[PDB]
Every structure is written in structure tokens, then in C-alpha cells.
Paper text:
Inhibition of PP2A:B55 is achieved by the intrinsically disordered proteins ARPP195,6 and FAM122A7. Consistent with our complementary NMR spectroscopy studies, both intrinsically disordered proteins bind PP2A:B55, but do so in highly distinct manners, leveraging multiple distinct binding sites on B55.
The remaining unaccounted density corresponds to tpARPP19 or FAM122A (tpARPP19 residues 42–75 and 86–112; FAM122A residues 81–111). tpARPP19 binds exclusively to B55 and PP2Ac using helices connected by extended yet ordered loops (helices are pre-populated in free ARPP19). The key interactions between B55 and ARPP19 are mediated by ARPP19 residues F-L-R-X-R-L-X-K. Because these residues in ARPP19 are helical, and not extended, we refer to this sequence as a short helical motif (SHELM). The thiophosphate and phosphate in the pre-dephosphorylation and product complexes overlap nearly perfectly. By contrast, the thiophosphoryl group of tpARPP19 is approximately 3 Å further away from both metal ions, in a position that is unproductive for dephosphorylation. This inhibitory conformation is stabilized by the interactions between the ARPP19 MASTL recognition residues (58KYFDSGDY65) with B55 and PP2Ac and the ARPP19 crossover (86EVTGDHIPTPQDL98), which is secured in place by the interaction of the ARPP19 C terminus at B55 site 3.
Residue numbers in the entry:
A (entry chain A): 9 to 589
B (entry chain D): 42 to 75, 86 to 112
C (entry chain C): 2 to 309
D (entry chain B): 8 to 60, 66 to 272, 278 to 399, 403 to 446
The structure:
């Protein structure tokens, strides 16, 4: 009874990490056997400062120690779990510290207000005041959980401790304080936020370390959402403006990457006066990364602008900047813009879209980079709603044709994925006249992946163009490949039938598809022959029971006598699966 | 002068003890389109020992 | 019952396709089955068209997956790998294990020939021994495969018109009959006909020559023309030599080299190719580049997430 | 006001067989100066700790481990030497100590920690490994930690490899406590101390065709304070300062430090090492014959130049024959930046006092193996009494690696195979 538990306990000292890792993951089982009292007195002290320091082992221990409240006797003795987690909060490894901090936060809620001021708050003070910055780094994440419930006198002490962390000599600590500054403000009183958070927020935003200033941008978003809209001009904007004009491109990247979040925080009035000029500068930034990040926000940023000046601002201030981006030398900037540029069509309307957006749309399709062209073609739905895609048909087709015939098969693969989406938007009329040839040409592509992708593409096209369209257009051409001299192309006929039969039903599969499959059973190449057995196995459920016995069974039985082992095996499998033998 | 481009390149290719098929064949393509490697063929004995066999440093003594 | 093993074998293939190594016990069982099949194959194994001829992979598993994505998936596409499945790669164990697994499962669909790296001595030099030891903690897996390598056919003959071998011709060998006379069930010699077939390379120079590899012989166009005429061979497909374009005709189209390891050693930046033989023996070459790796390149000029 | 350097300690065998594996290849003091790491061509790292009892206690062996081992790069048919090129201590973050050790190819993060707790207690056996009857398991007991003799354990935490095509010649930690750079002959990579699977190639001066190669990166270093500034020297004798704020890729240098006719000019001009001053306002570069100190605000010329050994300018022909002309000497700043130390031949290391412009030569030899013995300044001329003839110089005795205590006047001078520690005459 106790022997299995004794195995786990002994494994704690095992030199093998796997055995030690397994034992630690089952500490809950061990604690139950020991009991509530023994766990506090025996198990926890052994787990306080473990000699072993494997990252995974310590990480696993941190997760478990966060769920021992019941095992240690409930909230009354939850404070006994602090020392084990306090040690883990000081280890060099970041992930272990983060998990340890998470565990401390989880069990903090289970401390009663008296316990927090007696056991938890002192722990934060020890970590915050510790001489090792690993402890101080972890302390930053513990202020938010304890602050709301502690008394007013304790709250004053906590704010002073957090202020010291923001001024710590170690950049690692300051980065941690900046990261947690936003959440710590969400629990502080609004009066203290203006008087105490802002001085810290301003100081961090002007820190010498680029890695620390770039974190202040996120804190800027959170602080803005708390302050009254009228107080932003004096407390937030002065810091935000310099961030957008920061010397370090890393800081400017964060502003561009979080521009939409800033827009929803400062409000429409500030957005027009401050953000809009800032957004133009970001799109003209000397660093390609900043421009690419700003490009992603073009669609989101423009939508959230106030309706009173949305169209005018975009046409007069945003649109000119986009023109430069379309010509940007960097490939990634153009790719990022292409994926969102067409999203401005609904905002500007039909008349403005044709005169202004459309010339840029054509330029993107002519870009040398396949990714830019693929991004444009993938996002035609928004333009279709505003202006009929038939207007873009004469310009899309050259781009689609060029991509469909690209030397690199992976580029050809990408367009195949978007082909069913384009076919629906362009309609059956346009697809049959122009795009039908491209789809057939893919089925006989040298690269198997292209043929495989094209085979799947046929299924999707039939799902929306209907069974009748496939019978008139797709099926007759697919069956023509059965006579191809190359066995790879002949097998593609069976693969196409495998997917088409799933949607064409019995009305078509039995009449047209099945005769071709049975005829191919006599192919000289053994590879084709056993694909018929696999093909029949897959389309057999669709076929009516009478058809299976009359035609499928005699052909499968004949294959069972084939001289090739593979043909015999798959022929046997088909009969068993189809219950024909 | 005793420096030059080839002087730096030879210092980059320190040792060049063992013949490498990859480098040798890459050179041929460039030459046809317009030293490369060592001569010794690596042998299991020539390679370092399967496990460490070095004693503690005399500084620690 | 053979069906139960077949289902287990199919599970191994799916596991290997995910780049997950089989257990030592499974590898030991797999090799034993392979020996029973390989021991029955001749030194000059007859191969029936259509078939896709592939060159060296050298444990580049992610490129082997790329090869299948282009040539197709076994057993749908018949394959013929001309040796060098291990060494100079990060996934030699998975690469060789998958190929052996396919051979056991589809003996008639996939043909694996012996390369110069399918040897005990060389594998201990170019990482295969270390990889097996590192990925298993013991040399049993390496021992099993090396024993299996001894049964790999030396050469293949496709419809009696195309002769496929890893290396090249040998001074001691003038006709396919001589090849069949060799005792291949041994460690690769450092001299003699068996060594030459796996180490010889073609060259512009005439006649035989000293191979810079330190083994085998370098043969000119004179030897290739004589060998084809003597045995009535239309072509001599080969491997074992890095070619930038993936395939490289030589000796007035009497010999073609196929290399199926793109960006050889992850530094050469070469193209890989596989020669596909039509039902009527027509040969077509499909070049390809390395497959995109997840979280690569290791060293990137684009700003990483941690620094962004 | 000259510092009367006194012999304090000497470590290593006394005139032994001088095996190649025993040659010291790097000396690095800790940030606080308590620990002194030493690397050798054999891949072994020896860490010395100063006695805890201004301090002038002796340095005693603290930790020893095999940082790197010989390897064969089967992807290139190259034998990767296990020589330790550079050792760099990370800022102390907890009770443990961390340092970066790099050979030509791989950088390893090593954690040195003290353990004094022994887990004692078993259920299914004894401390001696003697098992018991499982049926006798009546009550479970948890192990306890027993105090034990202090032991120092060195383990590798993270391995940074497979990133440099060429030989790594420098590693430097950034002031942000997150990243560090590793510079090979033609490329500089930016790493994150907690990520090993990818690195960022900030600088890449490799020519498209190697036939056109004209210079290589010899050294690189981050600014001690600024997190966005680093300087890498080239074989042409020019130092490029890169501002990481301007752009993600530092291919374009913010500043270029250089000066406007010997036969070997192309060789002696190469900068062996570049070191920032502790304040960070000045920068020191060591070429073969001279030490040049550059003011970061002035690029046209150095503010100060010091000749390490002029008497060898006439012997460059002999030095070229024996390859001694290619030796990569190093330079070291003192705590206050007022004195710079660099090595020379015949176990000579030069001290240059920037404030007073005084210049002395000192010898690290066993003949003065008496603690608290003043070092007599040496004079080389080619001859008055007590002066050492230039012909007598033993060019096999090279003091390539030296280290200065960050705070006190304690210098670790590494000869071919012996480590010498000298202290100021208190
Ligand atoms: Fe080979
Ligand atoms: Zn090969």
C-alpha cells in the first residue's frame, strides 16, 4: 500500500532527471499519503531549497507548489507554502521565476487580509529589498495581488517599495517594474496614479536603456485607459510623443506595434491632433521594421478614426504615405501593407476607391515579390463588397496566371490554396472561361505536392459550384488523364476520383467515375493497379450495394490474384473493408 | 607587401587537415563556371577520443 | 500472422514520417526482417520501370520529406535510392530507419542500394555512430544498422538499359557478370571491385586516375563508353558526387550523376534532383531546394522576437 | 608615485614539459574581483577565489572544469580546437556565479555554485545502497538536508553553437543584462542569454566573392554603459563604432577611427584587441607594436599613443620568419583608467601611466619567487650594465593575456603556462 509511495519519495533523490521529474509531478499523491500535518513539517522543508537545479525539474515543482493549499491544511496554513516558492522566485532561470511568481499570485488570494500583512507582504518586502536582482525582479509581479486587500498603512509601504524598484540600478529590475507598472496602476487609487505612477512612468520612459523605454509604451496604454480623457494631455501625451520620436528604433517599433491600442485609449480628439502626425512619421521611419509594423495598422487605425473626418484625413494624410510604401524597397514592408491596404475600400467608398486605391492595387499586383501579390489576391473580399470584382478581373487574371506558372512550386502551392476563394468571388462564368485551364494544368504538374493540392482544390470548387458544374466541366477532363502514358499522371485520376466522389454522390460516381476506375484495374503498372483497390475501398461506401456486388467485387477479386504482393494486399483489404468477403 | 587578400584567406583556412568532398566539388563548379582542401582522409583513430581523457590543469594543483 | 506485423509496421512508418525515432527493440526487429529480404536480392538488383532514381540524402530527413512531396509518397511512387542514407546529417537515424521501414513494408516498391557511407568505419567518422549513441545511449542501434548494410545490393539494373550504382565503374569490373560474382555480404573493402563501385567518380581526364577521395578510381569518358557498349547499357546513373544543379550529365551523356541532398551539409547551397523514369524508360529530372525549416534560419538577418 | 608592484603568487608547474594543452589562453577577473577565471588551450577552466579575510588576500583554487572538449565537425571535416579564446563573467544575479566560455566555434554559459546540503534519508534502502525488504514499509519518511563540506560545482547551463562559420575571436556582454555579441573573422552575432536556438547577425562584412577579401574583424566589444554602442576593429587598423539605435542592422558604422611605411605595415597595423575604458569615454586598441587610446569624440587621430617595443621594429624580418609577428597581444585598463597594461616578449609586460606619461617594464619570472618582493624595472637596449640585450630576448616567452583587478591594484599576468598575480606594495 505504502510501497508505491515510497518509490516516488526515493526518486526525489534519484540522479536521473526523468525519475526525479516524474516524482515531483506526483507530489500531490505523496502529500496525501503523508497527511496534512506531515506535509507541512516534513515534505515542504525538503522542497524549500532543492539541491538539484534542472530547469524542467524546478519548473515542474513551481507548478505543483501552487496547488497545495488544500494539502497543507487549507488557507489557515497556506503561508507554509511561501518559503518553497520564495526560493524558486530567486533562481537564475527566468521561466522558473515567472512560474514561481504565478504560483505566489495564485495562493495570495487564499491568504486572509491578516495573513497578507503578516506573511505575504513581508515576503514581498524581502524579495523587493533582496540583494540579488533575481529576487527583486520577481518582487515586481507580487505588488498587484496584495495591494487591494492590505490596509491603507501597508498600501503606503508597498508604493514606496515599488518606487524603489523602478529606480533600481539593474536594468533587469527596471524592465520588470516597467512590465508590471501597468497592472499595478489598475489597482491603485486614481489620486495615487496621477501623483505616484506618472513620475515613475515618466522616469522609465526616459531611461537610458532602450530595452526599458520600449516597455514604457505598453505601460502608457494601460495608464491612459485609467486617467480621465482631459488629463492625458498633461500626464500621458508628453511621454507618448517622445516615444514616437525616440532615437531608438526599438522604442518606435513598440509605438507602431501598439498604435491601435493607443488610439482606443487617447480617444478620437487626441488621435487627430497627435497620433495622426505620429503615424505618418512611423510610416516614413528609416527602419524597415518600424515601417512594416506601421503598415499592419493602416486598416485598423483608419477604421477607428472619428466619422466626422475619417474620409478627409485618410485621403489627405494617410493615403499619400501609403503611396510611398507601395514603392518601398523592403520586401516585408510591401507585404505587410498589401495584406491590409485593400481594407480601406469600404471607408473611402466606391468613387474614392477607384480614383485613389485602385492605382495602388494594380501596382501591388505587378510587384516582383510573390508574397505581395499573394497578399493582395487573398484579401479581395473587402473590395468586392464596395466595387464589383469584375472591374478587377482584367487585372487579377494576369497576376493569377503568372503565379500559377511560377518556377518555384511553393509559390504555385500558395495560389492553389486561394484558388477556391477567388473562384467564388469571380463566379462560375469567369472561372470556366479563364481559370479552368489553370486548374487542369496543375493536375499534371511535375511536383506531386502541386498535384495533391490541385486534387483537393477540385473538391472545394465542386462544393460551391455544385455537382452539375463538375459533371459538365471537371469530370470529363479528369478522366482524360487515365490514358496518360506516365503512371504518376494516371494515378492522379484515381486520386481525383477519391475526393470528387465524396461530393458528386451516386448519381455521378457510378455512371461516370466508376467505369474509369474499373477500366484502370488492367493498367500494366502495378502502382496504378493497387491504387484502384485503395480507390474502390474509399468510394465503395458511396456506391450502391447492388453495384458493389455486380462490378466492384469481381474486379477486386481479380486483383486478389495479381502477381504483385501490393495489389493482392490492398485488394484483400478492400474486400474486408467493403464486406465483400 | 607580405599581406594582401590571399594572406588573410589562408589564415581563415586554419589547418585544412582533412579532405572534404563538399568543398572539393563546390570548387570544381566555380572553376568550370570561370588550397581548396586537405589531402588526409579522416580516420576514426585520428578523431578525438570517444570520451574525455584529459587530467586536471596543473594550475589547480 | 503477417497482417498484425504489417499494421505495426505501418504505425512505424507514420511515426518516422513525423521524425520520431523508433525504440531500440523496434529497430532490432526491423533490421532482422530487412536482412531476410535483402539477402535474397542479387548484387545487380533488377528494377522494373517506372521508377524514380534518387541520390544521396545523408540523413537530411527534412529534405527526404521534401523529396517525397515532389516525387510522391511510397508506395504510390517507386523509388531507387543509390546509397548514402546516413552521416553528415542531423537525422541519420530517422532517415535510414524510414528507408529500411519502407523497404520491409514495400520491398517491391522501394529499392535501396549500398553507398560508401553504409560502412562501419566511415559511419564512426561522420556522425552516424555518434547520433545513434546520442539518441539511444548505446551502440546497439548502430550495430544493428551496420550489420544490415552488408546485405544492401551494390548496384541496380533498370530494364537492362540503365545501370544504377552509388559510385562508378571499376578497373576489375568489365561486365555485369563480374559484379554478380562479388561477395557483397561483408564490410566495404578499402581496395578491389567492391570498393571501386562505391568510391569511383567520373572525370574529364581520360582513362583511369587517382581518386582524391583516397579510395576508388577516377575514370574518364573512355571507360564509360566501353562499359556501356560491352553490357548494352543506354545510361549509367550514379551518385556520390556533389553537383550544384542536382543532376549533371558527363562523358557525352553516358553517365549522369544524381544528388538528392539539397544544400548539402546545410552549407553548400546546391540544388537536389531526382531522375524519374517513365513507363517507357524516358528520363526526366526534377530539381528542388531545401524545405523550409521551422524556426530557421538559425542565424537570421531579420530582427528576432527577443530583440524586437 | 610609481606603483611598486610586488610578487604575490605564481601558479602552475615550475619549468615543466609545457604541453600545448597547458598553455594559458585567457585571464578574466570577476566583476567584483573576488574570482579570477583562467582558460587554456586544453579547454580547461580554473577559477581562483581571493581569501575573504581594500583586500590583498591570496587567490586560491575555487573551481575547475572542462569547458570545451575536442570535436570533429563532420559537416566540414574540421577538427574544432578546444582552446578557450575568451572568458566573460556575467553580472552576479544570485548566490551562483555565471561566465561565458568560448572556443573557436561554441560559446557555453557555465554556472558555478556552492552546495553544502546533503539529502539524507531513504525508505527502500540505506545510504550505502543496501536495499531492504519492501514488505517492511510501515511508515513513510521524507529525506532531510544535512550540512556537508562546502563543494563548488560547475555545470553548463546553455550552449550557443552552430552560428559562426569562421573562428570566434571575441565575446562581449551588453549592459542591458540580456544580450551579448560574438564576433568571428567576418560576422558579428547578437545573442540573448536565455535563447540558444537563434541569433541575430548584426554585422556581416564577408565579400560576395572571397577573392576580394581585404580585411577581417579582429575584436569587438560593447560599450560598458551604453546599451546601443559597440566597436569592432579590423585587420586594417580601423575601428568602426556602431549605434544600434540607428537601425536593426549595424552594417553602417556611426563613426570610423583611423589614422592617415614599413614593408610589414599590412601586418603590424592589425589591431589585436580593443578595450573600452571603465568610464567608457576612452577606447584603447592594441596593434603589434603600439598601444593607441582613442577619444570617442575624436576620430581623425588617437589622443595618446604608446610604443610597446620599439626595439623590435628593426627585427620584423626575423619575427616574420618564426611567425611571432602574428601574435595577438592584449591590453587592459586599470580601475581608474589612469594606467594601461599590455604584454610583450621575454616575459615582459609594460605599464603606461596616462596621467604622468611614465613608462616602466616589468618581468614575470620565477627567479623573483618571493612574496612581497619589489619588481626591478627592466631596460632593453642594443649596452649598459643590467640592461637586457635585444638579441637575448626569448620570443617564445610571450605574455599575451593579462588582467587587472576591477578595483584594487592586483594584476594577473599569464605567461605561457604560469599565472602570476602581483599586488601593490601596501
Ligand atoms: Fe557517397
Ligand atoms: Zn555521399
Amino acid at each position: 500500500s505504502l510501497y508505491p509511495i515510497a518509490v516516488l519519495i526515493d526518486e526525489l533523490r534519484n540522479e536521473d532527471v526523468q525519475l526525479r521529474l516524474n516524482s515531483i509531478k506526483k507530489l500531490s499523491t505523496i502529500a496525501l499519503a503523508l497527511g496534512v500535518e506531515r506535509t507541512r513539517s516534513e515534505l515542504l522543508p525538503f522542497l524549500t531549497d532543492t539541491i538539484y537545479d534542472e530547469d524542467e525539474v524546478l519548473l515542474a515543482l513551481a507548478e505543483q507548489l501552487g496547488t497545495f493549499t488544500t494539502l497543507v491544511g487549507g488557507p489557515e496554513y497556506v503561508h507554509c507554502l511561501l518559503p518553497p516558492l520564495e526560493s524558486l522566485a530567486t533562481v537564475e532561470e527566468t521561466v522558473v521565476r515567472d512560474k514561481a511568481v504565478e504560483s505566489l499570485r495564485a495562493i495570495s488570494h487564499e491568504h486572509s487580509p491578516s495573513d497578507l500583512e503578516a506573511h505575504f507582504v513581508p515576503l514581498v518586502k524581502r524579495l523587493a529589498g533582496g540583494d540579488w536582482f533575481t529576487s527583486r525582479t520577481s518582487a515586481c509581479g507580487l505588488f498587484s495581488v496584495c495591494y487591494p486587500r492590505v490596509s491603507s498603512a501597508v498600501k503606503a509601504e508597498l508604493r514606496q517599495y515599488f518606487r524603489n524598484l523602478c529606480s533600481d540600478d539593474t536594468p533587469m529590475v527596471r524592465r520588470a517594474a516597467a512590465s508590471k507598472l501597468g497592472e499595478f496602476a489598475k489597482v491603485l487609487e486614481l489620486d495615487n496614479v496621477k501623483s505616484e505612477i506618472i513620475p515613475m512612468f515618466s522616469n522609465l520612459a526616459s531611461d537610458e536603456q532602450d530595452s526599458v523605454r520600449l516597455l514604457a509604451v505598453e505601460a502608457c496604454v494601460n495608464i491612459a485607459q485609467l486617467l480621465p480623457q482631459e488629463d492625458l494631455e498633461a500626464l500621458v501625451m508628453p511621454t507618448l510623443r517622445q516615444a514616437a520620436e525616440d532615437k531608438s528604433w526599438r522604442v518606435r517599433y513598440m509605438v507602431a506595434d501598439k498604435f491601435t491600442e493607443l488610439q482606443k485609449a487617447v480617444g478620437p480628439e487626441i488621435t487627430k491632433t497627435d497620433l495622426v502626425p505620429a503615424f505618418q512619421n512611423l510610416m516614413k521611419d528609416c527602419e524597415a521594421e518600424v515601417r512594416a509594423a506601421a503598415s499592419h495598422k493602416v486598416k485598423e487605425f483608419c477604421e477607428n478614426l472619428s466619422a466626422d473626418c475619417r474620409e478627409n484625413v485618410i485621403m489627405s494624410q494617410i493615403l499619400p504615405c501609403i503611396k510611398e510604401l507601395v514603392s518601398d524597397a523592403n520586401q516585408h514592408v510591401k507585404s505587410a501593407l498589401a495584406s491590409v491596404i485593400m481594407g480601406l475600400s469600404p471607408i473611402l467608398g466606391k468613387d474614392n476607391t477607384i480614383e485613389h486605391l485602385l492605382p495602388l492595387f494594380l501596382a501591388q499586383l505587378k510587384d516582383e515579390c510573390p508574397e505581395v501579390r499573394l497578399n493582395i489576391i487573398s484579401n479581395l473580399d473587402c473590395v468586392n463588397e464596395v466595387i464589383g470584382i469584375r472591374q478587377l478581373s482584367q487585372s487579377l487574371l494576369p497576376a493569377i496566371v503568372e503565379l500559377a506558372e511560377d518556377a518555384k512550386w511553393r509559390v504555385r502551392l500558395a495560389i492553389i490554396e486561394y484558388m477556391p476563394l477567388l473562384a467564388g468571388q469571380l463566379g462560375v462564368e469567369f472561372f470556366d472561361e479563364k481559370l479552368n485551364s489553370l486548374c487542369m494544368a496543375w493536375l499534371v504538374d511535375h511536383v506531386y505536392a502541386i498535384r495533391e493540392a490541385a486534387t483537393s482544390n477540385l473538391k472545394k470548387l465542386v462544393e460551391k459550384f455544385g455537382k452539375e458544374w463538375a459533371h459538365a466541366t471537371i469530370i470529363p477532363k479528369v478522366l482524360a488523364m487515365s490514358g496518360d502514358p506516365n503512371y504518376l499522371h494516371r494515378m492522379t485520376t484515381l486520386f481525383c476520383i477519391n475526393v470528387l466522389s465524396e461530393v458528386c454522390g451516386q448519381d455521378i460516381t457510378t455512371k461516370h467515375m466508376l467505369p474509369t476506375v474499373l477500366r484502370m484495374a488492367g493498367d500494366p503498372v502495378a502502382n496504378v493497379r493497387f491504387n484502384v483497390a485503395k480507390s474502390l475501398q474509399k468510394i465503395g461506401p458511396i456506391l450502391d450495394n447492388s453495384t458493389l456486388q455486380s462490378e466492384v467485387k469481381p474486379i477486386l477479386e481479380k486483383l486478389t490474384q495479381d502477381q504483385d504482393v501490393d495489389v493482392k494486399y490492398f485488394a484483400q483489404e478492400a474486400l474486408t473493408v467493403l464486406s465483400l468477403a | 607587401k607580405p599581406g594582401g587578400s590571399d594572406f588573410l584567406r589562408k589564415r581563415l583556412q586554419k589547418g585544412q587537415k582533412y579532405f572534404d568532398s563538399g568543398d572539393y566539388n563546390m570548387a570544381k563548379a566555380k572553376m568550370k563556371n570561370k588550397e581548396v582542401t586537405g589531402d588526409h582522409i579522416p580516420t576514426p583513430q585520428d578523431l578525438p577520443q570517444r570520451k574525455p581523457a584529459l587530467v586536471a590543469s596543473k594550475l589547480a594543483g | 500472422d503477417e497482417k498484425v506485423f504489417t499494421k505495426e509496421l505501418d504505425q512505424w512508418i507514420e511515426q518516422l514520417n513525423e521524425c520520431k525515432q523508433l525504440s531500440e527493440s523496434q529497430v532490432k526487429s526491423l533490421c532482422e526482417k530487412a536482412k531476410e529480404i535483402l539477402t535474397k536480392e542479387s548484387n545487380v538488383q533488377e528494377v522494373r520501370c517506372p521508377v524514380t532514381v534518387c541520390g544521396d540524402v545523408h540523413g537530411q530527413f527534412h529534405d527526404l520529406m521534401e523529396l517525397f512531396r515532389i516525387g510522391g509518397k511510397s508506395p504510390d511512387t517507386n523509388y531507387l535510392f543509390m546509397g548514402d542514407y546516413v552521416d553528415r546529417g542531423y537525422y541519420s537515424v530517422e532517415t535510414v530507419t524510414l528507408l529500411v521501414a519502407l523497404k520491409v513494408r514495400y520491398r517491391e516498391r522501394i529499392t535501396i542500394l549500398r553507398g560508401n557511407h553504409e560502412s562501419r568505419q566511415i559511419t564512426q567518422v561522420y556522425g552516424f555512430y555518434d547520433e545513434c549513441l546520442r539518441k539511444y545511449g548505446n551502440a546497439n542501434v548502430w550495430k544493428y544498422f551496420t550489420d544490415l548494410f552488408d546485405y544492401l545490393p551494390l548496384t541496380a539494373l533498370v530494364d537492362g538499359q540503365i545501370f544504377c550504382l552509388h559510385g562508378g565503374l571499376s578497373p576489375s569490373i568489365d561486365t555485369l557478370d563480374h559484379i554478380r560474382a562479388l561477395d557483397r555480404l561483408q564490410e566495404v573493402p578499402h581496395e578491389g571491385p567492391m570498393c571501386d563501385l562505391l568510391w569511383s567518380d567520373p572525370d574529364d581526364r581520360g582513362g583511369w586516375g587517382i581518386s582524391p577521395r583516397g579510395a576508388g578510381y577516377t575514370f574518364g569518358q573512355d571507360i564509360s563508353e566501353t562499359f556501356n557498349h560491352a553490357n548494352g547499357l543506354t545510361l549509367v546513373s550514379r551518385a556520390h558526387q556533389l553537383v550544384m544543379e542536382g543532376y549533371n550529365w558527363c562523358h557525352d551523356r553516358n553517365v549522369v550523376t544524381i544528388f538528392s541532398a539539397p544544400n548539402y551539409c546545410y552549407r553548400c547551397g546546391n540544388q537536389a534532383a531526382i531522375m524519374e523514369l517513365d513507363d517507357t524508360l524516358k528520363y526526366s529530372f526534377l530539381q528542388f531546394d531545401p524545405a523550409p525549416r521551422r524556426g530557421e534560419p538559425h542565424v537570421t538577418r531579420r530582427t528576432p522576437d527577443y530583440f524586437l | 608615485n610609481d606603483i611598486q608592484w610586488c610578487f604575490s603568487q605564481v601558479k602552475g608547474a615550475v619549468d615543466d614539459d609545457v604541453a600545448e594543452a597547458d598553455i594559458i589562453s585567457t585571464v578574466e577577473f570577476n566583476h567584483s574581483g573576488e574570482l579570477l577565471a583562467t582558460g587554456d588551450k586544453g579547454g580547461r577552466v580554473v577559477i581562483f577565489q581571493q581569501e575573504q579575510e581594500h583586500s590583498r588576500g591570496e587567490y586560491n583554487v575555487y573551481s575547475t572544469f572542462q569547458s570545451h572538449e575536442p570535436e570533429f565537425d563532420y559537416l566540414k571535416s574540421l577538427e574544432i580546437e578546444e582552446k578557450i579564446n575568451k572568458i566573460r563573467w556575467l553580472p552576479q544575479k544570485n548566490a551562483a556565479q555565471f561566465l561565458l566560455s568560448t572556443n573557436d566555434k561554441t560559446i557555453k554559459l557555465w554556472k558555478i555554485s556552492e552546495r553544502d546540503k546533503r539529502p539524507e534519508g531513504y525508505n527502500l534502502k540505506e545510504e550505502d545502497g543496501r536495499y531492504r525488504d519492501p514488505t517492511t514499509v510501515t511508515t513513510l519518511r521524507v529525506p532531510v538536508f544535512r550540512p556537508m563540506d562546502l563543494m563548488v560545482e560547475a555545470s553548463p547551463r546553455r550552449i550557443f553553437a552552430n552560428a559562426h562559420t569562421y573562428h570566434i575571436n571575441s565575446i562581449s556582454i551588453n549592459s542591458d543584462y540580456e544580450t551579448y555579441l560574438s564576433a568571428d573573422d567576418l560576422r558579428i552575432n547578437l545573442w540573448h542569454l536565455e535563447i540558444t536556438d537563434r541569433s541575430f547577425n548584426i554585422v556581416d562584412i564577408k565579400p560576395a566573392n572571397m577573392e576580394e577579401l581585404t580585411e577581417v574583424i579582429t575584436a569587438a566589444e560593447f560599450h560598458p554603459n551604453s546599451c546601443n554602442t559597440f566597436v569592432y576593429s579590423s585587420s586594417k587598423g580601423t575601428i568602426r563604432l556602431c549605434d544600434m539605435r540607428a537601425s536593426a542592422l549595424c552594417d553602417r558604422h556611426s563613426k570610423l577611427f583611423e589614422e592617415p611605411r614599413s614593408f610589414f605595415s599590412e601586418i603590424i597595423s592589425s589591431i589585436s584587441d580593443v578595450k573600452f575604458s571603465h568610464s567608457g569615454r576612452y577606447m584603447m586598441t592594441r596593434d603589434y607594436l603600439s598601444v593607441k587610446i582613442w577619444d570617442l569624440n575624436m576620430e581623425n587621430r588617437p589622443v595618446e599613443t604608446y610604443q610597446v617595443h620599439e626595439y623590435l621594429r628593426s627585427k620584423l624580418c626575423s619575427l616574420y620568419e618564426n611567425d611571432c609577428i602574428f601574435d595577438k597581444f592584449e591590453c587592459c585598463w586599470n580601475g581608474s583608467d589612469s594606467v594601461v597594461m599590455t604584454g610583450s616578449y621575454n616575459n615582459f609586460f609594460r605599464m603606461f601611466d596616462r596621467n604622468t606619461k611614465r613608462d616602466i617594464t616589468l618581468e614575470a619570472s620565477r627567479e623573483n619567487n618571493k612574496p612581497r618582493t619589489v619588481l626591478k624595472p627592466r631596460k632593453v637596449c642594443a649596452r649598459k650594465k643590467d640592461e637586457i640585450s635585444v638579441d637575448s630576448l626569448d620570443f617564445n616567452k610571450k605574455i599575451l593575456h593579462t588582467a587587472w583587478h576591477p578595483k584594487e591594484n592586483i594584476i594577473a599576468v599569464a605567461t605561457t603556462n604560469n599565472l602570476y598575480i602581483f599586488q601593490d606594495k601596501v
